[PDB]
Design an enzyme around this catalytic site. Structure first.
Site, PDB file in Angstrom:
ATOM      1  N   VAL C  18     -28.815  22.664  36.948  1.00 15.67           N
ATOM      2  CA  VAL C  18     -28.056  22.177  36.572  1.00 15.67           C
ATOM      3  C   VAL C  18     -27.505  22.066  34.563  1.00 15.67           C
ATOM      4  CG1 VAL C  18     -25.962  20.771  37.009  1.00 15.67           C
ATOM      5  CG2 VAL C  18     -27.728  20.810  38.490  1.00 15.67           C
ATOM      6  N   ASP C  19     -27.121  22.867  34.232  1.00 15.65           N
ATOM      7  CA  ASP C  19     -26.744  23.202  32.730  1.00 15.65           C
ATOM      8  C   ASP C  19     -25.459  22.608  31.865  1.00 15.65           C
ATOM      9  OD1 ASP C  19     -26.767  23.042  29.698  1.00 15.65           O
ATOM     10  OD2 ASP C  19     -28.014  25.071  30.295  1.00 15.65           O
ATOM     11  N   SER C  20     -24.751  20.751  32.129  1.00 16.99           N
ATOM     12  CA  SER C  20     -23.328  21.030  31.380  1.00 16.99           C
ATOM     13  C   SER C  20     -23.371  21.622  29.340  1.00 16.99           C
ATOM     14  CB  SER C  20     -23.480  19.690  31.252  1.00 16.99           C
ATOM     15  OG  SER C  20     -24.398  18.916  30.308  1.00 16.99           O
TER      16      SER C  20
END
Lengths: 110, 121, 124, 126, 120, 124
Positions: C18-20
């Site tokens: 999960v990479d914003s």
């Protein structure tokens, strides 16, 4: 048509064929060979040679021989070998490849 | 005809044209530019391992293919591959058919025959 | 040691990173091969050969079914030759489903449902 | 909000903080370190002599600096790099230390109890 | 004479020829071939650094001193030297590289090796 | 196939490759070992920036005695790792002794004396 492509099928799989009258020999990329389950048909010669595969161009089926390469320049290069073997016309008036009496329209690219 | 060549003339000079549907752009060698005396006719022009960059562009040269004459634009290269590479630009500009049944280039309604292996090396 | 979630794409279990900070969701070619999605592609590509790094687009999957928690989501993503991570869940999909990265409870809150971030054992 | 940004202040200086859950470590550019007068606070703790080919590695570590996010103040440790790609990258280290929630429903960062809005494209340059 | 050069002419054009007893074959740069207008004469023979082989000149007229010589050479894209006078031509015309008198003695005539001024 | 001469360096028989195109005379390390000259050397080299061959310099022999025909000559040369030829007689020595490379008579004329170029059989 910006560069010349055709829709064909090899072993039933839809493929965009790059039409190159300047290439002596037809090639398919290794990735395209993998997508079309043709790896099981390969040779020990450049990744290998496919001695025979079924091409569906328009409504007709063609027996074909080609080489597999690691390069993804195009998925499939339809070269002068096959262009002349099936006695094609590259018709840029009508924008079609005329193979037997059949016209396959030039393409759907990005 | 192990590769496709045509006899054409540019500015009156006989040339062997290599017909390549896989090339976006028509090129002529510097040596062929010298033989056609087109060196004096050039333009400026590619940003900042091959394709031999550019010598210049010919904005217009008159091509004789068959009995008909055609306006052409092309690039001159130091690349000696072929004297003249007839690319997809010109193939479509004149709405040619590469007919490998009759072994001819059908340009308007006229047919120009592909050269035999003897006419080439 | 970073944020991972268990998801499924076209029925296949995946560990999603999960990479914003990533504008786009990506899957590795090897993962695409494992999920039999090679025949499912586009003509999506990255011009002619300028930038000096990563590798580039193999192609795009226009729509695939994602199973996150109990709910199913329609998704698009790009396939790349780089195997750095099998699946990167990016800001495109993070905002498309209006997800919350809750680091208090250590969960991804997608709708009203909460998906826990994986423990280091659930990762190699 | 073409990416996730927050307005923060470090050593009193206004900064646009890039919010990245995929970064293990918070970084500030050297230029941002100089603009925030944090250079006199630096260390020798670095990335050695075995290197890569591109990231201009580590200038040093700031062991503690005050961040002002919203109305509250936060003690922070981060690394300074030569790469000016982004001024300040708010990484997973700080995201988890203050147990932040990245809320893309309300488009806010919820950090202690307060909500800090993600910046519009206007608040960010060409 | 920081290396050995000779003044020669090919198709009328002045050239500085690099004299190399260690080279099996005489070569001319493509740039030199262009400046001498020998482009229309090229076989275009190739090989299957110095950017390899452009093509072969089967015969070109060389003026070395007051005599004219028929010559065969290869053209290359490498600019190392404009013209490399190799062992092929050195022996074909039975030359002496005389470093006593600093001359190339081709027939009975002596062509002087060039001063460092006549070169970079 | 090329120009070779029989010479002696510090008493040892050698086949010298005659190259007017080489600025400097070189000897291979194997020839330096065969001529017992390894202990006799210097710290001479070519910096840090280079190409993809020549195997760079090992060091310099400041003086070795050359026997060409009946006469003896002082020489300096560099030793390399490269076994291209055992000994490359370059333009330095060619001009130092005012040699004539005579391809009419197929000889090296070093003083008034003529040293014949070797037959292809005398080369291996």
């Amino acid at each position: 048509v910006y560069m010349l492509f055709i829709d064909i099928e090899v072993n039933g799989v839809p493929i965009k064929a790059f039409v190159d009258s300047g290439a002596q020999s037809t090639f398919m990329s290794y990735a395209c060979a993998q997508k079309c389950s043709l790896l099981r048909l390969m040779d020990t010669r450049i990744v290998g040679k496919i001695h025979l595969a079924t091409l569906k161009i328009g409504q007709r089926f063609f027996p074909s021989s080609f080489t597999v390469l690691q390069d993804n320049k195009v998925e499939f290069l339809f070269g002068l070998d096959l262009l002349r073997r099936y006695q094609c016309c590259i018709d840029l008036k009508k924008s079609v490849l005329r193979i037997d009496n059949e016209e396959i329209p030039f393409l759907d690219i990005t």
